[PDB]
Amino acid sequence: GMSHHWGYGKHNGPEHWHKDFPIAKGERQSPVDIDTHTAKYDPSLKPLSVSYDQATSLRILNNGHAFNVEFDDSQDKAVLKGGPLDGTYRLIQFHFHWGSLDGQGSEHTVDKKKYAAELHLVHWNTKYGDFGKAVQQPDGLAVLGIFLKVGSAKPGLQKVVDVLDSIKTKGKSADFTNFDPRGLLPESLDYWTYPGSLTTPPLLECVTWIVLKEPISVSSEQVLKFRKLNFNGEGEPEELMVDNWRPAQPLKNRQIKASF
Ligand SMILES: NS(=O)(=O)c1ccc(C(=O)N2CCC(O)(c3ccccc3)CC2)cc1
Numbered sequence: 001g002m003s004h005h006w007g008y009g010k011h012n013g014p015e016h017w018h019k020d021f022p023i024a025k026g027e028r029q030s031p032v033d034i035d036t037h038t039a040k041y042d043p044s045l046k047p048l049s050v051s052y053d054q055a056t057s058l059r060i061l062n063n064g065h066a067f068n069v070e071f072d073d074s075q076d077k078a079v080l081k082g083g084p085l086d087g088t089y090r091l092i093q094f095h096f097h098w099g100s101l102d103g104q105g106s107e108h109t110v111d112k113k114k115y116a117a118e119l120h121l122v123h124w125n126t127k128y129g130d131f132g133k134a135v136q137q138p139d140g141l142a143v144l145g146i147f148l149k150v151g152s153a154k155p156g157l158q159k160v161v162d163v164l165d166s167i168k169t170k171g172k173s174a175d176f177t178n179f180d181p182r183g184l185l186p187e188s189l190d191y192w193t194y195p196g197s198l199t200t201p202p203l204l205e206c207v208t209w210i211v212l213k214e215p216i217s218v219s220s221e222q223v224l225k226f227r228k229l230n231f232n233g234e235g236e237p238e239e240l241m242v243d244n245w246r247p248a249q250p251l252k253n254r255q256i257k258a259s260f
Pocket residue numbers: 120122131132133135143197198199200201202
């Protein structure tokens with residue numbers, strides 16, 4: 001992807017992506033608006049299992065689109081299973097999408113409501129051996145999405161907030177060990193699930209989306225720090241990393257299932 005030029009600006013944003021990635025207008029694109037009244041309870045959905053006790057974080061990277069907290073996924077240490085999933089999915093990284101204002105920022109919406117941000121915990125199906133092979137499969141990834149609203153601070157998020165100063169610009173990375181992703185989860189694991197895609201180019205249709213109903217609360221100071229990051233690289237004109245979210249896409253021939 002050394003020649004990719006997509007972004008979130010007026011000239012390379014979501015409405016332009018289809019030119020280089022035609023799948024942008026595909027049959028199972030994400031995100032989507034979750035109409036809570038139309039989603040149907042599916043009593044066959046097995047309980048969701050989030051096993052992050054042995055998670056091993058390694059580094060945090062500003063990739064020019066968001067920042068990723070990466071994990072060691074060379075072993076089954078932090079896995080997601082159950083719910084609508086068949087098999088074991090290993091945590092590889094998490095990142096967020098956020099806005100320039102508290103009134104926008106999330107990718108998925110709930111009855112058209114936009115949250116201040118959205119956390120994506122990305123996992124890949126171990127039956128495919130590695131992440132690169134998994135994204136070529138319809139059931140290759142499972143992304144656990146969690147909404148963020150502004151209110152009380154999330155103590156478990158502070159370690160991330162404080163390290164952002166070291167990765168202000170595109171390409172910067174910093175050691176980020178011993179971070180516990182369990183501190184970013186809400187109390188309830190009630191969720192909505194549907195078949196979708198990566199929300200950024202290449203927009204591959206390889207994701208089983210599991211979006212939690214309960215948002216976590218973060219403080220204004222915490223999200224404000226996210227907005228101080230840069231899309232640009234060091235020594236380049238400063239462009240604040242804000243509004244790095246793709247808007248809701250057509251649901252088309254899909255049904256959103258609720259676990260509750
Ligand atoms: N917001 S999202 O849908 O949760 C998401 C998750 C991961 C990525 C990601 O890491 N990308 C996309 C896939 C990627 O382009 C790729 C493609 C093919 C092989 C290996 C990696 C690598 C970069 C992008 C978006």
